[PDB]
């Protein structure tokens, strides 16, 4: 059985094939417009890809239950707190569903070999990607499923760490009720896995840690002159 609340969260999920096709198409156009001697760094491509993923994350949140009840100022503060966590969580879940050993699956539907990526990404991003991959294997061994995934999405979005909200009670309420729903869902559908609830919740500090360290790294890369300028990715970094 599925708690009614989780069903409401599922209703708000975007159509993934259309999100991925849209991003794929956008990046194909940008490549086409670049000439021979305007090669774009592999890091720069990933920045553009992450940038377009952020657009879809924003529009997902905008239309989601509870979130759409908040005033825009509150909405901005929530997304400014968790944008990088949602990117990383989306990345992690994509590998859980579609990942194969030795390859990474991008939001475009592309499959890329890790040996190719690891040659280019540098030590810091290789370290953070390895930490993320350890969460992937952990979540795959727990049989992490879509109902649990959408719960964690909302627990990440409605964070108690966000300060200065006009309606902090809603955020507190959603956080509490999603927790109770997840606790209920795991108990009913995975009754033999006592550790599942805790293991899931324990990934959120780890995702938080990976995402915040990733933000700090990207801010460094921006200050260093490496990020393709003017886009949503840069705006989220500075705010």
């Amino acid at each position: 059985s599925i708690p009614h609340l989780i069903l409401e969260l599922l209703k708000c999920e975007p159509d993934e094939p259309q999100v991925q096709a849209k991003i794929m198409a956008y990046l194909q156009q940008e490549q086409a417009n670049r000439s021979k001697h305007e090669k774009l760094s592999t890091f720069g491509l990933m920045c553009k890809m992450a940038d377009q993923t952020l657009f879809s994350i924003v529009e997902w949140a905008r239309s989601s239950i509870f979130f759409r009840e908040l005033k825009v100022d509150d909405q901005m503060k929530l997304l400014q707190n968790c944008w990088s966590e949602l990117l990383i969580l989306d990345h992690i879940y994509r590998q859980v569903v579609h990942g194969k050993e030795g390859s990474i699956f991008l939001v475009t539907g592309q499959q890329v070999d890790y040996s190719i990526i690891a040659s280019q990404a540098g030590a810091t991003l290789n370290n953070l990607m390895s930490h993320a991959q350890e969460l992937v294997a952990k979540l795959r061994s727990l049989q992490f499923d879509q109902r649990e995934f959408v719960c964690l999405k909302f627990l990440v979005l409605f964070s108690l760490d966000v300060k200065n909200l006009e309606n902090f009670q809603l955020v507190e309420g959603v956080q509490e009720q999603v927790n109770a729903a997840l606790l209920d869902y795991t108990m009913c559908n995975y009754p033999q896995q006592t550790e599942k609830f805790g293991q899931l919740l324990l990934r959120l500090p780890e995702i938080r840690a990976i995402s915040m360290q990733a933000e700090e790294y990207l801010y460094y890369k921006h200050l260093n002159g490496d990020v393709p300028y003017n886009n949503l990715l840069i705006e989220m970094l500075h705010a």
Binding site: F55, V58, E59, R62, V72, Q75, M76, L79, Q80, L232, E235, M236, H238, A239
Partner: peptide, 11 residues
Amino acid sequence: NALLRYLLDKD
């Protein structure tokens, strides 16, 4: 963050 505000408000 004008851009984020715009994405949340645009019709």
